[PDB]
Design a binder for this molecule. Structure first.
Ligand SMILES: [Ca+2]
Lengths: 6, 240
């Protein structure tokens, strides 16, 4: 999971 | 936003740019939704860093004067108390920012409408993501606000093995996953706007995409489900 963010 | 189109200037007046101070300038880092004249809803992970933040409302082009912007400091940050930076997949990726001044509403600056508590959208519901995030995986921020059409993917499908499996929770909304259009870094914290009974409401706060890339087939963009947090939001505003 990659937060997106910036 | 990967595979977006440029939004019209007055389409999404609750969208904000959350920026941090960087030298003698300001850098966009995340989106947000204006929910009161002095409150913004964004993602918790956008405000983990010990930075100085400001909110820009009435923004369209990050790189040019639009003649419509209002700039305001962030006075208080209230992160969901269950948020854990080490565990985005656990959920609770939501925070409220109290602004130092109340902003002025107009065609470019409006409060976002939130869904009723507990509302869940039918599979494949029409929504748009908006933001200034990267326009390609490992690309660069947009200059102008982008929108992309991202239909919801319901929990049953989204939490299935070829999609997100156990990573997605019922406190989240999935949307997109077509391999072409998606949120991307820099869109976090901004809105997913979904059309319900003729009115757009902000059903998601952009949270995460795949570590593999932004636009990945069967890895729809994942959002915090706003309707899971209505009581929390009202409680914070009431006590602050
Ligand atoms: Ca501007």
């Amino acid at each position: 999971v990659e937060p997106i963010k910036a | 936003v990967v595979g977006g189109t440029e939004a019209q200037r007055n389409s999404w007046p609750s969208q904000i740019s959350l920026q941090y101070r960087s030298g003698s300038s300001w850098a966009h880092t995340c989106g947000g939704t204006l929910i009161r004249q002095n409150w913004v809803m964004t993602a918790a992970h956008c405000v983990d860093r010990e930075l100085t933040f400001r909110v820009v409302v009435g923004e369209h082009n990050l790189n040019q004067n639009n003649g419509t912007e209002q700039y305001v400091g962030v006075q208080k940050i209230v992160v969901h108390p269950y948020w854990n930076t080490d565990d985005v997949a656990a959920g609770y990726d939501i925070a409220l920012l109290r602004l130092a001044q109340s902003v002025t509403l107009n065609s470019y600056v409006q409060l976002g409408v939130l869904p009723r508590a507990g509302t869940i959208l039918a599979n494949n519901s029409p929504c748009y993501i908006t933001g200034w995030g990267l326009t390609r995986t490992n690309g660069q921020l947009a200059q102008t606000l982008q929108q992309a059409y991202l239909p919801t993917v319901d929990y049953a499908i989204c939490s299935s093995s070829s999609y997100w499996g156990s990573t997605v929770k019922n406190s989240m909304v999935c949307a997109g996953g077509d391999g072409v259009r998606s949120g991307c870094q820099g869109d976090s914290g901004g809105p997913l706007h979904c059309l319900v009974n003729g009115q757009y409401a902000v059903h998601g706060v952009t949270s995460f995409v795949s570590r593999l890339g932004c636009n990945v087939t069967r890895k729809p963009t994942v959002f915090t489900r706003v309707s899971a947090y209505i009581s929390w939001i009202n409680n914070v505003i009431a006590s602050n």
